[PDB]
Design an enzyme around this catalytic site. Structure first.
Site, PDB file in Angstrom:
ATOM      1  CG  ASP A  17     -14.047  15.948  -6.523  1.00  0.00           C
ATOM      2  OD1 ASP A  17     -14.106  17.193  -6.529  1.00  0.00           O
ATOM      3  OD2 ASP A  17     -14.501  15.242  -5.599  1.00  0.00           O
ATOM      4  CG  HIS A  45     -14.591  23.033 -10.339  1.00  0.00           C
ATOM      5  ND1 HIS A  45     -15.625  23.709 -10.947  1.00  0.00           N
ATOM      6  CD2 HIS A  45     -15.157  21.987  -9.691  1.00  0.00           C
ATOM      7  CE1 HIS A  45     -16.767  23.102 -10.677  1.00  0.00           C
ATOM      8  NE2 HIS A  45     -16.512  22.055  -9.915  1.00  0.00           N
TER       9      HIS A  45
HETATM   10  N1  LIG Z   1      -2.891  12.862 -13.643  1.00  0.00           N
HETATM   11  C1  LIG Z   1      -4.009  13.515 -14.002  1.00  0.00           C
HETATM   12  N2  LIG Z   1      -4.597  14.341 -13.147  1.00  0.00           N
HETATM   13  C2  LIG Z   1      -5.705  14.912 -13.675  1.00  0.00           C
HETATM   14  C3  LIG Z   1      -6.243  14.746 -14.936  1.00  0.00           C
HETATM   15  N3  LIG Z   1      -7.386  15.523 -15.090  1.00  0.00           N
HETATM   16  C4  LIG Z   1      -7.528  16.123 -13.939  1.00  0.00           C
HETATM   17  N4  LIG Z   1      -6.560  15.773 -13.027  1.00  0.00           N
HETATM   18  C5  LIG Z   1      -6.477  16.177 -11.628  1.00  0.00           C
HETATM   19  O1  LIG Z   1      -7.473  15.461 -10.930  1.00  0.00           O
HETATM   20  C6  LIG Z   1      -8.025  16.288  -9.874  1.00  0.00           C
HETATM   21  C7  LIG Z   1      -9.537  16.323  -9.982  1.00  0.00           C
HETATM   22  O2  LIG Z   1     -10.105  17.041  -8.890  1.00  0.00           O
HETATM   23  P1  LIG Z   1     -11.017  18.327  -9.131  1.00  0.00           P
HETATM   24  O3  LIG Z   1     -10.146  19.436  -9.629  1.00  0.00           O
HETATM   25  O4  LIG Z   1     -11.845  18.531  -7.896  1.00  0.00           O
HETATM   26  O5  LIG Z   1     -12.111  18.067 -10.314  1.00  0.00           O
HETATM   27  P2  LIG Z   1     -13.474  18.926 -10.566  1.00  0.00           P
HETATM   28  O6  LIG Z   1     -14.102  19.172  -9.205  1.00  0.00           O
HETATM   29  O7  LIG Z   1     -14.334  18.019 -11.430  1.00  0.00           O
HETATM   30  O8  LIG Z   1     -13.026  20.186 -11.290  1.00  0.00           O
HETATM   31  C8  LIG Z   1      -7.308  17.628  -9.958  1.00  0.00           C
HETATM   32  O9  LIG Z   1      -6.296  17.691  -8.959  1.00  0.00           O
HETATM   33  C9  LIG Z   1      -6.768  17.654 -11.385  1.00  0.00           C
HETATM   34  O10 LIG Z   1      -5.596  18.423 -11.540  1.00  0.00           O
HETATM   35  C10 LIG Z   1      -5.603  13.856 -15.839  1.00  0.00           C
HETATM   36  O11 LIG Z   1      -5.928  13.572 -16.991  1.00  0.00           O
HETATM   37  N5  LIG Z   1      -4.474  13.269 -15.272  1.00  0.00           N
HETATM   38  O1  LIG Z   2     -24.153  19.571   0.967  1.00  0.00           O
HETATM   39  P1  LIG Z   2     -22.808  19.484   0.267  1.00  0.00           P
HETATM   40  O2  LIG Z   2     -21.728  20.304   0.940  1.00  0.00           O
HETATM   41  O3  LIG Z   2     -22.896  19.763  -1.227  1.00  0.00           O
HETATM   42  O4  LIG Z   2     -22.390  17.920   0.425  1.00  0.00           O
HETATM   43  C1  LIG Z   2     -23.272  16.862  -0.022  1.00  0.00           C
HETATM   44  C2  LIG Z   2     -22.459  15.753  -0.651  1.00  0.00           C
HETATM   45  O5  LIG Z   2     -21.932  16.174  -1.941  1.00  0.00           O
HETATM   46  C3  LIG Z   2     -20.526  16.008  -1.954  1.00  0.00           C
HETATM   47  N1  LIG Z   2     -19.962  17.048  -2.819  1.00  0.00           N
HETATM   48  C4  LIG Z   2     -20.401  18.344  -2.948  1.00  0.00           C
HETATM   49  N2  LIG Z   2     -19.774  19.024  -3.877  1.00  0.00           N
HETATM   50  C5  LIG Z   2     -18.841  18.125  -4.383  1.00  0.00           C
HETATM   51  C6  LIG Z   2     -17.875  18.233  -5.412  1.00  0.00           C
HETATM   52  O6  LIG Z   2     -17.984  19.180  -6.204  1.00  0.00           O
HETATM   53  P2  LIG Z   2     -17.030  19.410  -7.515  1.00  0.00           P
HETATM   54  O7  LIG Z   2     -17.088  18.112  -8.331  1.00  0.00           O
HETATM   55  O8  LIG Z   2     -17.619  20.602  -8.266  1.00  0.00           O
HETATM   56  O9  LIG Z   2     -15.626  19.725  -6.978  1.00  0.00           O
HETATM   57  N3  LIG Z   2     -17.088  17.159  -5.642  1.00  0.00           N
HETATM   58  C7  LIG Z   2     -17.275  16.051  -4.904  1.00  0.00           C
HETATM   59  N4  LIG Z   2     -18.157  15.821  -3.933  1.00  0.00           N
HETATM   60  C8  LIG Z   2     -18.922  16.911  -3.717  1.00  0.00           C
HETATM   61  C9  LIG Z   2     -20.095  16.063  -0.491  1.00  0.00           C
HETATM   62  O10 LIG Z   2     -18.860  15.414  -0.286  1.00  0.00           O
HETATM   63  C10 LIG Z   2     -21.255  15.343   0.187  1.00  0.00           C
HETATM   64  O11 LIG Z   2     -21.136  13.922   0.232  1.00  0.00           O
HETATM   65  O1  LIG Z   3     -13.251  19.512  -5.030  1.00  0.00           O
HETATM   66  C1  LIG Z   3     -14.220  19.502  -4.139  1.00  0.00           C
HETATM   67  N1  LIG Z   3     -14.482  18.413  -3.447  1.00  0.00           N
HETATM   68  O2  LIG Z   3     -13.827  17.305  -3.707  1.00  0.00           O
HETATM   69  C2  LIG Z   3     -15.140  18.508  -2.332  1.00  0.00           C
HETATM   70  C3  LIG Z   3     -14.405  18.297  -1.030  1.00  0.00           C
HETATM   71  O3  LIG Z   3     -13.227  18.708  -0.950  1.00  0.00           O
HETATM   72  O4  LIG Z   3     -14.990  17.723  -0.094  1.00  0.00           O
HETATM   73 MG   LIG Z   4     -13.732  19.125  -7.231  1.00  0.00          MG
END
Ligand SMILES: Nc1nc2c(ncn2[C@@H]2O[C@H](COP(=O)(O)OP(=O)(O)O)[C@@H](O)[C@H]2O)c(=O)[nH]1
Ligand SMILES: O=P(O)(O)OC[C@H]1O[C@@H](n2cnc3c(OP(=O)(O)O)ncnc32)[C@H](O)[C@@H]1O
Ligand SMILES: O=CN(O)CC(=O)O
Ligand SMILES: [Mg+2]
Ligand SMILES: Nc1nc2c(ncn2[C@@H]2O[C@H](COP(=O)(O)OP(=O)(O)O)[C@@H](O)[C@H]2O)c(=O)[nH]1
Ligand SMILES: O=P(O)(O)OC[C@H]1O[C@@H](n2cnc3c(OP(=O)(O)O)ncnc32)[C@H](O)[C@@H]1O
Ligand SMILES: O=CN(O)CC(=O)O
Ligand SMILES: [Mg+2]
Lengths: 431, 431
Positions: A17, A45
């Site tokens: 994330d 994502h």
């Molecule tokens: N304020 C702010 N939010 C951001 C920025 N980059 C990403 N985000 C937000 O941070 C969150 C990151 O969670 P996630 O989407 O799971 O990231 P990913 O799993 O790595 O794709 C999302 O809700 C994005 O919209 C940034 O530069 N500023």
């Molecule tokens: O067996 P699983 O279901 O994969 O869980 C194992 C561990 O990994 C974490 N986890 C799995 N995918 C994750 C994710 O993916 P993105 O960055 O692509 O959005 N972002 C954050 N945490 C993540 C879970 O919270 C848990 O501790």
């Molecule tokens: O964006 C995905 N994760 O943060 C995993 C979760 O929701 O547990």
């Molecule tokens: Mg994520």
């Protein structure tokens, strides 16, 4: 040129994330192919464009790009119901003819409903046994990767070949799990029937991914983007084992999950959040369970994109980042959510760990050692100004610029992007 | 140079036993570090030097090189009893102070006695159920890689930390398997006790492999050699699934099994036997169950270095080789056992597969499709001369040279070495 073109890769440098969806979206605008190489829909994502927001899980984030082809590699484990369920949620958001630009590798393994059910059971079992579990997304990722290793799992190509043979092994695989969890109920013909349906739905999208990527890399020049899922410290090999996901989220996962050699890998970008977050169980050295944690969690809207779970928050941690760089060899970084810090007067940054009053020479292989270290910080001065509007390096105020440099310097990797918002245009390219 | 040095890799391009041990031995003479990145002791690598012969399994083949450091990476699954049992067999052959130049990554997973026992049981069970099994080396490789994915397996670092904690999970893991095979008997304290012993024995050799390889690649220049195990078509992702081993034997396995980026991978050599062999169950298109098979099997001494099992033999198969090259991106080849063919008047070589009288556009993801293809050959003229003595490109006779070219041409990869014997000097470097 005989060898072929080199793909660009976006990887998470922390515990997920970090903003991979936002970074991939940005880079996917002029890409010919955007793909996923590992993991399943445990990933969440987020992409924001023109006020429109999407949350992807199995679909590559570049799926919104109508000129590009989204490709799901063999390293990915797919849960068909969830896939369409996901794709159909985005239809209602304007995703049209996605099924026209989505290729699925025929070697990808299948996540079956009982896998997800087993995921649940195993968690409840570890909890109600040793006191704590892993905190998985309960999407059946661990169970399905375990069937893969065991060679008992089924793949796309299996589903699309003779169905009578498929059903034979499907019934057998299910029984195997019921032996693990007798209380586990599986509607064989029920699930198996749906599967028969999915087969015809996915069929037209399936292909031989090896030939596909190969041909793409050696044919007329194309731009291929690889979207990493999860992150380095969640890596089955290199993360905080056993509190990790069941696939290699590191750079090597690109090679094993798409079938391409290291000679076809170009830029490898590390997505780094300005502070750290973790969702699930496991050590978190800079975790801030206090007023600071709440401001970060709140200002950052830190809640699982996949489970709705509130993510744990902490200061930036350079130990994990430098470790991540050792394994991924990042060519440049994307420092995200810098704007979240706009309000802090000062910002602490972890630089090293100390176990017995003594500093550790390197990131611990043993995760429990990590739960005993005492991190030493480096308090930096906040800029206390709104950066959400910056679009150039100069727009950023003095102390904001120093924060970016602090990161570049302590890692030895250049920051090529700075995030100041979740929308695609809320980016600053430093070079 | 800031990035670091690039490792040299030796990989199997077929179904194993192509001569990786011989190739690695040759290249290891002036290497500073020789390592294993995946698999366990299911591997059997033969090295011959000065009339002295060795059969390695877990120990990197460069272990005989007293100036070099042999390193076992995190991608490898180790069975401690077998490791010392192996090392102690080679002591009796002159291996002195090996324990002085062997590093073991602390993230490597452990193969437990019950894993091997479960391996056996699962095979007997698949056989006495569906009629046929995988034909594993019964070394408990599949079971231990399955525990890894499940995150239930234990690692080196676990064994060396608090033993009371280790024993706790060890007992729990064992029980889990007994739930799979109730008839499975495990002497918990018995095995657990031995483990306690091994801990102190291995301890001095263990290290953080990530920091180790990293430091090695960026410090004063060094020559690192990576010894692949098994082979491409045995790859858990890309091989003849489910008739494969449980690890990635392809190039990406180097990255995930040692924690190094694609930017640190230099030459990737593909070891190609002049004809094909397979040991275990599964499709084998050019298999020769006849007089030709017997001559190859016999002249080549084709019997498992690990199980003593007689290997299946067939003509060279370019379909699998070209497929192997697509995934590994070989920089050059090592064509081994050319001398085995010295006596044939003619040599058939598979060039393509045909299912419905129609040729296949690419290597089938479905292994059963493979059991129905009709390969079309390209009969080449033998040289009917002894090449075991050749040491230069010219020593080889005309038709021998044509055979090497045939391979270079149909693959698009240069042959850098030609094997004409099992001894280190029985090699021809073409450039
Ligand atoms: N304020 C702010 N939010 C951001 C920025 N980059 C990403 N985000 C937000 O941070 C969150 C990151 O969670 P996630 O989407 O799971 O990231 P990913 O799993 O790595 O794709 C999302 O809700 C994005 O919209 C940034 O530069 N500023
Ligand atoms: O067996 P699983 O279901 O994969 O869980 C194992 C561990 O990994 C974490 N986890 C799995 N995918 C994750 C994710 O993916 P993105 O960055 O692509 O959005 N972002 C954050 N945490 C993540 C879970 O919270 C848990 O501790
Ligand atoms: O964006 C995905 N994760 O943060 C995993 C979760 O929701 O547990
Ligand atoms: Mg994520
Ligand atoms: N005659 C002959 N034997 C060879 C040659 N190269 C290797 N061998 C032998 O072929 C066998 C290959 O089996 P194995 O050692 O399992 O190969 P690995 O598993 O790939 O290391 C060994 O017994 C080698 O000594 C060669 O060029 N000629
Ligand atoms: O679960 P496993 O015990 O790994 O068995 C799965 C399948 O893989 C085969 N196999 C495993 N390692 C092999 C090897 O390694 P080297 O080339 O390094 O000497 N050479 C040849 N065949 C090999 C087994 O015969 C079986 O069919
Ligand atoms: O050299 C190892 N193999 O050939 C495996 C076996 O003996 O089965
Ligand atoms: Mg062998």
């Amino acid at each position: 040129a005989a060898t072929g073109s080199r793909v660009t890769v976006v990887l998470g440098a922390q515990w997920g994330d970090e903003g991979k969806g936002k970074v991939v979206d940005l880079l996917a605008t002029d890409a010919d192919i955007v793909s996923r190489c590992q993991g399943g829909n445990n990933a969440g994502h987020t992409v924001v464009v023109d006020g429109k927001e999407y949350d992807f899980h199995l679909l590559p984030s570049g799926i919104i790009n109508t000129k590009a082809v989204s490709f799901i590699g063999n390293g990915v484990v797919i849960h068909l119901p969830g896939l369409f369920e996901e794709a159909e949620k985005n239809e209602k958001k304007g995703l049209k003819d996605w099924e026209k630009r989505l290729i699925i590798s025929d070697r990808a393994h299948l996540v079956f409903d009982f896998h997800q059910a087993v995921d649940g059971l195993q968690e409840v079992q570890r909890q109600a046994q040793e006191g704590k579990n892993i905190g998985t997304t309960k999407k059946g990722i661990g169970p399905t990767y375990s069937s893969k290793a065991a060679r008992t799992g089924l793949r796309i190509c299996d589903l699309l070949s003779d169905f009578d043979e498929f059903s034979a092994r499907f019934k057998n695989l299910a029984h195997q799990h019921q032996s693990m969890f007798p209380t586990l109920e599986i509607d064989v013909e029920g699930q198996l029937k749906r599967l028969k349906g999915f087969a015809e739905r996915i069929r037209p999208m399936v292909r031989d991914g090896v030939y596909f990527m190969y041909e793409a890399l050696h044919g007329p020049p194309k731009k291929v983007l690889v979207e990493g899922a999860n992150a380095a410290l969640l890596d089955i090999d290199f993360g905080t084992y056993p509190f990790v996901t069941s696939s290699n989220c590191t750079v090597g996962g690109v090679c094993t999950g798409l079938g391409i050699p290291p000679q076809n890998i170009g830029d490898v970008y590390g997505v780094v959040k300005a502070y750290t977050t973790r969702v699930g169980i496991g050590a978190f050295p800079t975790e801030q369970i206090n007023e600071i944690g709440d401001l970060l969690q709140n200002r950052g809207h830190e809640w699982g994109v996949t489970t709705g779970r509130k993510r744990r928050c902490g200061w930036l941690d350079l130990m994990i980042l430098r470790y991540a760089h050792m394994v991924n060899g990042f060519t440049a970084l994307a420092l995200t959510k810098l704007d979240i810090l706009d309000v802090l007067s000062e910002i602490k940054v972890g630089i090293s760990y100390k176990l017995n009053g003594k500093r550790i020479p390197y990131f611990p292989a043993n995760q429990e050692i990590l739960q005993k270290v005492e991190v030493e910080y480096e308090t930096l001065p906040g800029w206390k100004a709104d950066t959400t509007g910056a679009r150039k390096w100069e727009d950023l105020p003095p102390q904001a610029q120093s924060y970016v440099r602090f990161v570049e310097n302590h890692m030895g990797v250049a920051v090529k992007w700075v995030g100041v918002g979740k929308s695609r245009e809320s980016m600053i390219q430093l070079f």
